[PDB]
Amino acid sequence: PSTSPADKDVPMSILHTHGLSYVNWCMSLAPGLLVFEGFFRARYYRSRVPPSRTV
């Protein structure tokens, strides 16, 4: 039948994490999101020009 063993329930803590290297973080592609969010937002909201007066 359905089961829910206690082996899956284990302690958890962020202190025990090995973590990532600088290279793995660069390969995680977060910095690309960081740049390209602003890029695409800028392109979209800059395509639509408002009216103006030339001084």
Partner: protein, 274 residues
């Protein structure tokens, strides 16, 4: 007990990961539609264009969506799904394989069942003996005492009919395996180089610094990954459709010239004579 035959199914995270792939299709809104329209109108002209077009659109957009979720939305299955062979053989290749058999399946089936009655194709077949051989003997060839070996003949003729539908399967499998190998090996090699560099820098902490930069390296690797995978996806699509043309769609070339009509306002009928 004896009658109990038990089977184990390995079930994981499927529902919530598969829902967002279809939900994203409203956002993408078939951006590849123009490209696939151009290619389909290059390769074939028939009333059933829209069918195959829509099919290819669905397949390609699913590929694109999965790839982008594999690059960006990294959770659970979205990472493995492009590194797995089952996805590359059944989730992308099988649909493209069965698409022409689902659009022009009537014509292909009739063609195959006519090719089981194997015969020599004559251009400008104004011959009479060809017709008598085809009706009386069944074929142009000599069919004397082939019933003696009919058991193999059936299946061999079946293969003889589908031999010109088999290279499509071969090319689909080949390019699916190619994409799987490309993704897997490039990811593995890149990660291996990363780990060796980190071992060198961990053993030499004068170098364990953001030596290229926090964003420079990441942006460059992002561009490298996306450029390479975009090239690979464009290759897999362009080649899939060009080989679809050159292998399956040249069968359906039926050019009808336009003949001017003259008897518009009057038609001869059975009552005109009888």
């Amino acid at each position: 007990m004896l009658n109990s035959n038990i089977y184990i199914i390995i079930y994981g995270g499927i529902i919530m990961y598969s829902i967002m792939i279809i939900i994203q299709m409203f956002l993408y809104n078939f951006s590849n539609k123009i490209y696939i329209e151009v290619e389909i109108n290059k390769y074939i002209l028939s009333k059933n264009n829209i069918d195959i077009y829509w099919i290819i659109c669905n397949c390609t957009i699913i590929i694109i969506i999965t790839t982008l979720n594999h690059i960006i939305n990294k959770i659970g299955i979205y990472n493995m799904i492009e590194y797995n062979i089952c996805y590359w053989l059944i989730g992308t290749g099988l649909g493209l394989y069965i698409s022409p058999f689902i659009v022009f399946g009537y014509k292909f089936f009739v063609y195959i069942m006519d090719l089981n009655n194997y015969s020599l194709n004559i251009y400008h077949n104004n011959n009479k003996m060809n017709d008598i051989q085809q009706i009386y003997n069944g074929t142009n060839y000599n069919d004397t005492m082939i019933f003696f070996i009919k058991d193999i003949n059936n299946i061999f003729t079946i293969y003889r009919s589908i031999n010109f539908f088999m290279n499509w399967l071969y090319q689909m499998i080949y390019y699916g395996v190619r994409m799987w190998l490309v993704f897997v090996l490039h990811s593995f090699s890149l990660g291996s180089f990363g780990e060796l560099i980190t071992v060198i820098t961990d053993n030499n902490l004068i170098f364990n610094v953001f030596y290229i930069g926090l964003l420079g390296l990441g942006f460059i690797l992002y561009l490298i990954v996306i450029f390479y995978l975009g090239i690979q996806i464009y290759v897999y699509i362009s080649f899939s459709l060009s080989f679809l043309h050159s292998t399956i769609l040249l069968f359906l070339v039926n050019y009808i010239p336009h003949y001017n009509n003259k008897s518009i306002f009057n038609t001869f009928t059975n009552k005109s004579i009888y």
